[PDB]
Amino acid sequence: MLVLVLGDLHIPHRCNSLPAKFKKLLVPGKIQHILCTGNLCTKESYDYLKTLAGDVHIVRGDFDENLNYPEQKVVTVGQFKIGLIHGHQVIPWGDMASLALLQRQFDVDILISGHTHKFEAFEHENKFYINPGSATGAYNALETNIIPSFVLMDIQASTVVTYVYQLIGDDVKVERIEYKKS
Amino acid sequence: LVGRFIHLLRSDDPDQQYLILNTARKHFGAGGNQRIRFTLPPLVFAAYQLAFRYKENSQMDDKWEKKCQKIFSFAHQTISALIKAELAELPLRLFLQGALAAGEIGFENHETVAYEFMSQAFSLYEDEISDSKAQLAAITLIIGTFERMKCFSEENHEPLRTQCALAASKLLKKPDQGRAVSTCAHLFWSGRNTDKNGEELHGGKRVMECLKKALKIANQCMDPSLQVQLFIEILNRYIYFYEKENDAVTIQVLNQLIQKIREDLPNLESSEETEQINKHFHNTLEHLRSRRESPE
To answer: Which Cys pairs does UniProt list as disulfide-bonded (chain B)?
Structure first.
């Protein structure tokens, strides 16, 4: 009933596997929904994702050796309409104004984007925007200091709480944000 | 057979990583084109990573700039071997990544290398990307990647600017062409060059020209639904540049374009498709409602 939001695995292009801790915390059964933004590249990562949950959703990334993954998707979980896109199509790449522009195009309560490798979760114009970052802390040309991070959120009703996991050093820090449908 | 062990990762002290990179390329190269399609791109990304590692130890190494030059020569070599394995979408993407990295690092003569990597990506775009969708994805990646580079002088910035606009305006489909030109408008605003002392170029008049051409393409669509879609999109792009304090955007331009959508908008047949497009226009209008400090 809680969703796992991750992306930018970049296996085997930039990373060989997921962080050991991340492999441990991710255990099957407990999550029934998966939203993937990044270019996980190889199909191995997809099969691994299929072990974590039954409802796996992906969008095409710029580096996906893909077999017709969608470029963009819109999915509903009871409440809230969620948009899933890898983000390289949003120009400027990390600009929030362009992201709000795309939000208006989608007309969705939550917009999930990636390709920035920088986690960001905030509320703009009574709407929510999430970016889980790189779940493997993969290399990015625009940032030397990348923090391995993924986002899971649980929807109880018209309220979602997004818990963001980041691996800083060797300890697992977590930040919590909550949003109410306005 | 996951020969793609190479999760060696670990290692510290740059020079040893450079030598192991050469050893990995040398070993993988005898695998033939079949293996190098997958095995070599990781080495290209490792080369970029190692160049950034060389930049972090700039003081401890007096030869790091030449080290970066040799590292990018290595990356160029590996990408070219991928090209020789009859690969098209991947090598161009790798070239774009190399241009991004080379632009950020800042070693001596890095501007020439970033330009050369960009030109290589363009060279693959013009001749080895025939498919419509693939041309759109390749070009849009090029505009996006090139929009973030700030390591370019006006000398090199102008050719890539005009070349991006031209390449985006000669796409197969007319809707795709209009979308690409609208995306290309960002280069003429949010672009950065060496001679503005870090400033954004802020070419307001240069921005309008791109947006003007986008409208002209939308009329020739001859298809009510898609023709309409564009209009909500081009107006939205207009909103972005207006809301970024660009004096070149006027309220009259907004009023005329917004009226032109309102005039022919109802004339489509009721469906889910037209449903979402009406809502898209309504969301635009609602956003414009918020704290108007701009007449209509």
So the answer is: none
Other beta carbons within 10 angstroms of residue B205's beta carbon come to: 10
**Domain chopping of chain B, boundaries:** 14-221
Best CATH choice for the domain B14-221 from the list 1.10.260.40, 3.30.40.10, 1.10.10.10, 1.25.40.660: 1.25.40.660
B209 closest CA partner among B230, B231, B236, B189: B189
Record: contact A142-B287, CB cut-off 8 A: no
- Nearest by CB to B148, from A62, A125, A142: name it: A142
Closest by CA to B31, choosing from B82, B79, B77, is: B82
Say whether A101 and B49 touch across the interface (CB within 8 A).
no
Instruction: Answer whether B93 sits within 8 Å of A63, measured CB to CB.
Output: yes
User: Is B246 exposed, middle or buried, given 0-12, 13-18 or 19+ CB atoms closer than 10 A?
Assistant: middle
Report the chain B residue with the minimal C-alpha distance to residue A94.
Answer: B148
Of A12, A65, A141, the CB nearest to B97: A141
Experimental method: X-ray
The tokens of B130 are what?
A: 């025939």
Tokens of B172: 């197969």
Pick from B266, B296, B289: which is nearest to B278 by CA?
A: B266
Beta-carbon pairs below 8 A across chains A and B: 76
Q: Residue B174, Cα to own-chain centre: how many angstroms?
A: 20
Chain B residues whose CB is inside 8 A of the A76 CB are none
* CA neighbor of B233 nearest in space, from A19, A74, A91: A91
A2-180, which class in CATH?
A: alpha beta
SS3 (DSSP) at B290: coil
User: Strand A149-155 and strand A33-36: pairing?
Assistant: unpaired
CA distance B200 to A90: 19
- Optimal mutation site among B55, B71, B240, interface A, most CBs of chain A within 10 A: B240
Q: At what angle do helices B33-56 and B89-105 cross, to 10 degrees?
A: 10
Distance from CA of B209 to the nearest CA of A (A): 18
How far, in Å, CA of B272 to CA of B274, rounded? 6
